[PDB]
Design a binder for this molecule. Structure first.
Ligand SMILES: [Mg+2]
Ligand SMILES: [Mg+2]
Ligand SMILES: [Mg+2]
Ligand SMILES: [Mg+2]
Ligand SMILES: [Mg+2]
Ligand SMILES: [Mg+2]
Ligand SMILES: [Mg+2]
Ligand SMILES: [Mg+2]
Ligand SMILES: [Mg+2]
Ligand SMILES: [Mg+2]
Ligand SMILES: [Mg+2]
Ligand SMILES: [Mg+2]
Ligand SMILES: [Mg+2]
Ligand SMILES: [Mg+2]
Ligand SMILES: [Mg+2]
Ligand SMILES: [Mg+2]
Ligand SMILES: [Mg+2]
Ligand SMILES: [Mg+2]
Ligand SMILES: [Mg+2]
Ligand SMILES: [Mg+2]
Ligand SMILES: [Mg+2]
Ligand SMILES: [Mg+2]
Ligand SMILES: [Mg+2]
Ligand SMILES: [Mg+2]
Ligand SMILES: [Mg+2]
Ligand SMILES: [Mg+2]
Ligand SMILES: [Mg+2]
Ligand SMILES: [Mg+2]
Ligand SMILES: [Mg+2]
Ligand SMILES: [Mg+2]
Ligand SMILES: [Mg+2]
Ligand SMILES: [Mg+2]
Ligand SMILES: [Mg+2]
Ligand SMILES: [Mg+2]
Ligand SMILES: [Mg+2]
Ligand SMILES: [Mg+2]
Ligand SMILES: [Mg+2]
Ligand SMILES: [Mg+2]
Ligand SMILES: [Mg+2]
Ligand SMILES: [Mg+2]
Ligand SMILES: [Mg+2]
Ligand SMILES: [Mg+2]
Ligand SMILES: [Mg+2]
Ligand SMILES: [Mg+2]
Ligand SMILES: [Mg+2]
Ligand SMILES: [Mg+2]
Ligand SMILES: [Mg+2]
Ligand SMILES: [Mg+2]
Ligand SMILES: [Mg+2]
Ligand SMILES: [Mg+2]
Ligand SMILES: [Mg+2]
Ligand SMILES: [Mg+2]
Ligand SMILES: [Mg+2]
Ligand SMILES: [Mg+2]
Ligand SMILES: [Mg+2]
Ligand SMILES: [Mg+2]
Ligand SMILES: [Mg+2]
Ligand SMILES: [Mg+2]
Ligand SMILES: [Mg+2]
Ligand SMILES: [Mg+2]
Ligand SMILES: [Mg+2]
Ligand SMILES: [Mg+2]
Ligand SMILES: [Mg+2]
Ligand SMILES: [Mg+2]
Ligand SMILES: [Mg+2]
Ligand SMILES: [Mg+2]
Ligand SMILES: [Mg+2]
Ligand SMILES: [Mg+2]
Ligand SMILES: [Mg+2]
Ligand SMILES: [Mg+2]
Ligand SMILES: [Mg+2]
Ligand SMILES: [Mg+2]
Ligand SMILES: [Mg+2]
Ligand SMILES: [Mg+2]
Ligand SMILES: [Mg+2]
Ligand SMILES: [Mg+2]
Ligand SMILES: [Mg+2]
Ligand SMILES: [Mg+2]
Ligand SMILES: [Mg+2]
Ligand SMILES: [Mg+2]
Ligand SMILES: [Mg+2]
Ligand SMILES: [Mg+2]
Ligand SMILES: [Mg+2]
Ligand SMILES: [Mg+2]
Ligand SMILES: [Mg+2]
Ligand SMILES: [Mg+2]
Ligand SMILES: [Mg+2]
Ligand SMILES: [Mg+2]
Ligand SMILES: [Mg+2]
Ligand SMILES: [Mg+2]
Ligand SMILES: [Mg+2]
Ligand SMILES: [Mg+2]
Ligand SMILES: [Mg+2]
Ligand SMILES: [Mg+2]
Ligand SMILES: [Mg+2]
Ligand SMILES: [Mg+2]
Ligand SMILES: [Mg+2]
Ligand SMILES: [Mg+2]
Ligand SMILES: [Mg+2]
Ligand SMILES: [Mg+2]
Ligand SMILES: [Mg+2]
Ligand SMILES: [Mg+2]
Ligand SMILES: [Mg+2]
Ligand SMILES: [Mg+2]
Ligand SMILES: [Mg+2]
Ligand SMILES: [Mg+2]
Ligand SMILES: [Mg+2]
Ligand SMILES: [Mg+2]
Ligand SMILES: [Mg+2]
Ligand SMILES: [Mg+2]
Ligand SMILES: [Mg+2]
Ligand SMILES: [Mg+2]
Ligand SMILES: [Mg+2]
Ligand SMILES: [Mg+2]
Ligand SMILES: [Mg+2]
Ligand SMILES: [Mg+2]
Ligand SMILES: [Mg+2]
Ligand SMILES: [Mg+2]
Ligand SMILES: [Mg+2]
Ligand SMILES: [Mg+2]
Ligand SMILES: [Mg+2]
Ligand SMILES: [Mg+2]
Ligand SMILES: [Mg+2]
Ligand SMILES: [Mg+2]
Ligand SMILES: [Mg+2]
Ligand SMILES: [Mg+2]
Ligand SMILES: [Mg+2]
Ligand SMILES: [Mg+2]
Ligand SMILES: [Mg+2]
Ligand SMILES: [Mg+2]
Ligand SMILES: [Mg+2]
Ligand SMILES: [Mg+2]
Ligand SMILES: [Mg+2]
Ligand SMILES: [Mg+2]
Ligand SMILES: [Mg+2]
Ligand SMILES: [Mg+2]
Ligand SMILES: [Mg+2]
Ligand SMILES: [Mg+2]
Ligand SMILES: [Mg+2]
Ligand SMILES: [Mg+2]
Ligand SMILES: [Mg+2]
Ligand SMILES: [Mg+2]
Ligand SMILES: [Mg+2]
Ligand SMILES: [Mg+2]
Ligand SMILES: [Mg+2]
Ligand SMILES: [Mg+2]
Ligand SMILES: [Mg+2]
Lengths: 97, 76, 63, 44
RNA sequence: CCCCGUGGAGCUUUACUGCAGCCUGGUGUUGGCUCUUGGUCGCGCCGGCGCGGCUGGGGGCCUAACCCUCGGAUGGGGGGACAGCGCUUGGCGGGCAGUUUGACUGGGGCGGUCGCCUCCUAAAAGGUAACGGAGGCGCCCAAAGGUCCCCUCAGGCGGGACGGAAAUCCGCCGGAGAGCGCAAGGGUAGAAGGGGGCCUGACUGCGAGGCCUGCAAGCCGAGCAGGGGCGAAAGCCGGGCCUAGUGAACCGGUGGU
RNA sequence: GUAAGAGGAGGUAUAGGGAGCGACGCUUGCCCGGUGCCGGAAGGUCAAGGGGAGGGGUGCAAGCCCCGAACCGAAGCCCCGG
RNA sequence: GGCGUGCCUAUUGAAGCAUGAGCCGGCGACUCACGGUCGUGGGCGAGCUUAAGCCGUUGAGGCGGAGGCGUAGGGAAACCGAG
RNA sequence: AGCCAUGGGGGAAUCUGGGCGGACCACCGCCUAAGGCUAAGUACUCCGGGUGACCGAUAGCGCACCAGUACCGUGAGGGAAA
RNA sequence: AACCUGGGGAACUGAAACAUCUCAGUACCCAGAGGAGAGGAAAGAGAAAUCGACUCCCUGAGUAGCGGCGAGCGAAAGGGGA
């Protein structure tokens, strides 16, 4: 009946705009721990065919886990993620065009 | 008439007591003026709020002329 | 059918990865004029709520 | 009167309160910006 | 009847907000000739004269749009680029329409009050009601702030040119009955009070841990890093002895990354 | 009545609408500050629109586009009087 | 002979001079759809699951991964990522 | 605040044409307004049939029965029992 | 009977008052179509040097966004189908 707890305030900037959302590339965080699970040649094709991509626009391996030896084609690598695979594998970056 | 008036209670006075274990910074006692003085390992703020500076036990020490002091004896 | 997310509360409250609800500190935009540097700084950060935290959860549910 | 101090050769403000008629027209008190450290702050 | 419900309806107006209606500028329907003032482009002539398109305005005449009318007239008469009508401007606008018109309250109305601080009520923790008793706040200050050093009252009695209940000065007694910007209270001279010297920590980036608390909010804060002030230094400074001096969110203003 | 139109009236200020008072007799005083209505070619304010000093965006450029001062702009309200 | 103030409702309080009910029979009030949250029975597991629809059947199922939830968070965002 | 549509005013060009890609400008790309027609997949159920962890005469349609009837109302309309 | 298309178009109610807003282009009045009706071969979509009429279902998605940024309201591209 009083001022709802709506007394809190919208910091959220970019909260909207007439034409709406901007089409920008979406990077899916995929950990190299689950990546090391299977072995061969990991590419976006495989991770989406069965795993943790789900048609997400881009792939970006990263984080905890221990890197198996293999070529890992991704669209982006974490600085720390580039270390694990460099220490026993190849760093195949993304496309470009 | 013209009376019904009063500022809400401030809930001051002795917050911690002698023989109580205290962390670092716990307000030991909130007060109006200097009803209590600082002491060993005990600072105070703008409102005369007394609060621990170390970890330990509270103790009160009356000293007639000087007044009433409160300190914390460190230990671990 | 299909609860609608309360937009007004999404536009001002993010739910944490665990289950907590965070939001910005109140009273920092208007009342201001000259308040201790402590105040305006204390007001910069975000906090957690309590019981109504569960209330607000029940809106951004599909979210 | 609500006062606001500016920084020299820069763009920084600060909370203040000047006096209208009371003996106080300008404000030449020093202060500390974020860029570098310590520079005089005029009223403006 | 009476009260209550964020019920209804009829009615009122200088309640709010529309609407019809009426007034009004531009423009379309909308045309001709002429006189007069301002402008405008080119030329003949020393800011002005002569010519044309375009004109803005003002006065006049015209007829063929448009309107009225006359023995059914492809016409005559009257009016006439006005009126009417379309779009658009602003204004008057209970004729009409939709609604608003707080709560507490020893029934309601009238009166009074509505948030913040101090004291009492309050029953020796905290808390605690009444249209209980009694007062304040919606500010003030670049010195009334920081720091260094220095000084200590009010009053009573005695004594002193103006003055003496009380100006100012010397003396003796004088632990706080003064002062602390302002209410009250707690506190305080072993300063928080009075006075100088240097200065602007009425800094930025933070915040261990607590008081208070239904939520939100309010409150205290050591210590850390940066750069700085006062002091030989240990050290103090993140505004004023402290408790009031205020306003969630929304919408919008100005300056920056 | 949206309109066409109709009532007014197939009437014409000795008529038609509105308002108040209310046969008839004797009478109907003072106050225009406020409100209303009436009058007032000046002046103040005022919308669209006309105007365009000056300013901005972009482009290699000619340009395109936007912002905008003075000044001309009704009724209304202010003002003046009944 | 002993004892003994109807039922319901509403209430601080009802046998109440508070409400409702002449009596009987029948009718009569917490449901469903979608989404949500907790619990619970069970299937599978870093995976789990299908929607329209197509094929079959005529009280038969199967197919269909498009898509959804989950495997990473933090920040307004750019971005970064076990931070 | 674009795109689409258009009541009012101004008012073009025919591929060196013209519209669009969220103000505007340049760049890159898209599409060709101001004429018309076009089956199927889709909606519904007065009508026929089939089926029901649908009802069984206070139910089920208002009507299992000569019911939109009797009766009611100026009328629109209301509307049983059995 | 209902379905459909166009022209016109409410209020209760919600917002715990109410005026924008909501109810809702719903109710309903009207004109027209037919076993359907509408729509329909890009002056399209919108970021892929990609798609390729129209309708219908699943999804996208309670997303994007709109909003006294209240109450609420709520797309499209794309993907799976007829
Ligand atoms: Mg309120
Ligand atoms: Mg009281
Ligand atoms: Mg009190
Ligand atoms: Mg301090
Ligand atoms: Mg202090
Ligand atoms: Mg955690
Ligand atoms: Mg702002
Ligand atoms: Mg202010
Ligand atoms: Mg400060
Ligand atoms: Mg900051
Ligand atoms: Mg989702
Ligand atoms: Mg109420
Ligand atoms: Mg009501
Ligand atoms: Mg009412
Ligand atoms: Mg009402
Ligand atoms: Mg009415
Ligand atoms: Mg008025
Ligand atoms: Mg109207
Ligand atoms: Mg009109
Ligand atoms: Mg006009
Ligand atoms: Mg007009
Ligand atoms: Mg004209
Ligand atoms: Mg003239
Ligand atoms: Mg002329
Ligand atoms: Mg003249
Ligand atoms: Mg001239
Ligand atoms: Mg000239
Ligand atoms: Mg001349
Ligand atoms: Mg001449
Ligand atoms: Mg001329
Ligand atoms: Mg004439
Ligand atoms: Mg004529
Ligand atoms: Mg004539
Ligand atoms: Mg004339
Ligand atoms: Mg005219
Ligand atoms: Mg018009
Ligand atoms: Mg108007
Ligand atoms: Mg209404
Ligand atoms: Mg209403
Ligand atoms: Mg009341
Ligand atoms: Mg009374
Ligand atoms: Mg009153
Ligand atoms: Mg007192
Ligand atoms: Mg007490
Ligand atoms: Mg007490
Ligand atoms: Mg007690
Ligand atoms: Mg109590
Ligand atoms: Mg009393
Ligand atoms: Mg001084
Ligand atoms: Mg002072
Ligand atoms: Mg002073
Ligand atoms: Mg004396
Ligand atoms: Mg004396
Ligand atoms: Mg003397
Ligand atoms: Mg003298
Ligand atoms: Mg004192
Ligand atoms: Mg001090
Ligand atoms: Mg002194
Ligand atoms: Mg002083
Ligand atoms: Mg000093
Ligand atoms: Mg804390
Ligand atoms: Mg709290
Ligand atoms: Mg304070
Ligand atoms: Mg240095
Ligand atoms: Mg301090
Ligand atoms: Mg103070
Ligand atoms: Mg001081
Ligand atoms: Mg206090
Ligand atoms: Mg609001
Ligand atoms: Mg009309
Ligand atoms: Mg007539
Ligand atoms: Mg007649
Ligand atoms: Mg007559
Ligand atoms: Mg008359
Ligand atoms: Mg009269
Ligand atoms: Mg009389
Ligand atoms: Mg006489
Ligand atoms: Mg008279
Ligand atoms: Mg008279
Ligand atoms: Mg007289
Ligand atoms: Mg008058
Ligand atoms: Mg007047
Ligand atoms: Mg004038
Ligand atoms: Mg203009
Ligand atoms: Mg112009
Ligand atoms: Mg220029
Ligand atoms: Mg110019
Ligand atoms: Mg340029
Ligand atoms: Mg000027
Ligand atoms: Mg005028
Ligand atoms: Mg006058
Ligand atoms: Mg017996
Ligand atoms: Mg009870
Ligand atoms: Mg009885
Ligand atoms: Mg009774
Ligand atoms: Mg009763
Ligand atoms: Mg009952
Ligand atoms: Mg009875
Ligand atoms: Mg009965
Ligand atoms: Mg669903
Ligand atoms: Mg459910
Ligand atoms: Mg829960
Ligand atoms: Mg479950
Ligand atoms: Mg089990
Ligand atoms: Mg579905
Ligand atoms: Mg087959
Ligand atoms: Mg089949
Ligand atoms: Mg069979
Ligand atoms: Mg997640
Ligand atoms: Mg870590
Ligand atoms: Mg047009
Ligand atoms: Mg041509
Ligand atoms: Mg040609
Ligand atoms: Mg040609
Ligand atoms: Mg060509
Ligand atoms: Mg050509
Ligand atoms: Mg664009
Ligand atoms: Mg190219
Ligand atoms: Mg296109
Ligand atoms: Mg064509
Ligand atoms: Mg078909
Ligand atoms: Mg049938
Ligand atoms: Mg029977
Ligand atoms: Mg029977
Ligand atoms: Mg039959
Ligand atoms: Mg028969
Ligand atoms: Mg009957
Ligand atoms: Mg009858
Ligand atoms: Mg009936
Ligand atoms: Mg309404
Ligand atoms: Mg509301
Ligand atoms: Mg009402
Ligand atoms: Mg609508
Ligand atoms: Mg319509
Ligand atoms: Mg068909
Ligand atoms: Mg067809
Ligand atoms: Mg067709
Ligand atoms: Mg068509
Ligand atoms: Mg067609
Ligand atoms: Mg389409
Ligand atoms: Mg369908
Ligand atoms: Mg769904
Ligand atoms: Mg919207
Ligand atoms: Mg809407
Ligand atoms: Mg709608
Ligand atoms: Mg699709
Ligand atoms: Mg498709």
């Amino acid at each position: 009946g009083r001022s709802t707890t709506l007394m809190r305030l919208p910091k959220r900037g970019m909260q909207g705009q007439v034409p709406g959302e901007i089409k920008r590339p979406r990077y899916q965080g995929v950990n190299l721990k689950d990546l090391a699970r299977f072995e061969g040649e990991v590419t976006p094709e495989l991770l989406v065919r069965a795993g943790l991509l789900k048609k997400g626009y881009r792939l970006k391996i990263l984080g905890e886990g221990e890197a198996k030896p293999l070529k890992v084609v991704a669209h982006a690598f974490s600085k720390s993620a580039l270390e694990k695979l460099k220490a026993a594998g190849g760093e195949p970056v993304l496309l470009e065009a | 008439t013209k009376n019904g008036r009063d500022s809400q209670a401030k809930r001051l006075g002795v917050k911690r007591y002698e023989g109580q274990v205290v962390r670092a910074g716990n307000i030991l006692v909130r007060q109006r003026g200097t009803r209590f003085k600082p002491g060993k390992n005990v600072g105070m703020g703008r409102d005369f709020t007394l609060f621990a500076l170390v970890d330990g036990v509270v103790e009160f020490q009356d000293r007639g002329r000087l007044g009433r002091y409160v300190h914390v004896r460190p230990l671990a | 059918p299909k609860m609608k997310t309360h937009k007004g509360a999404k536009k001002r409250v993010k739910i944490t990865a665990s289950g907590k609800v965070v939001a910005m500190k109140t009273g920092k935009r208007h009342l201001n004029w000259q308040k201790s540097g402590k105040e305006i700084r204390q007001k910069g950060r975000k906090f957690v709520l309590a019981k109504p935290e569960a209330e607000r959860i029940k809106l951004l549910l599909p979210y | 009167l609500l006062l606001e101090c500016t920084e020299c050769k820069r763009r920084n403000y600060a909370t203040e309160k000047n006096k209208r008629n009371t003996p106080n027209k300008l404000e030449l008190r020093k202060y500390c910006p974020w860029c570098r450290k310590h520079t005089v702050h005029r009223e403006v």
